[PDB]
Each structure stands twice: as structure tokens, then as C-alpha cells.
Amino acid sequence: SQHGRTQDENPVVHFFKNIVTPRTPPPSQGKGRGLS
Numbered sequence: 001s002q003h004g005r006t007q008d009e010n011p012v013v014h015f016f017k018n019i020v021t022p023r024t025p026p027p028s029q030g031k032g033r034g035l036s
Helices: 011-020
Strands: none
Touching: none
8 A cells, every 4th residue: 555644545435436537546545544
């Protein structure tokens, strides 16, 4: 996973974004990065 201030993206959310957004969704983040 990637590091940042963004919450760990779920693979289900990624799939959702794949459907509704033609642009490549952002990569999943480390667990707890959203709170960091």
C-alpha cells in the first residue's frame, strides 16, 4: 500500500470508482493513514 494522509481505500470502493470514474482511481493507502 501507499503512504499519505488518505484513508486506506477498500477494493470495493476502488471497483466503485472504476465504474463511475473513467480516470484511474487512487491506490490503496496504509491502514491508519487516514487518521495520520
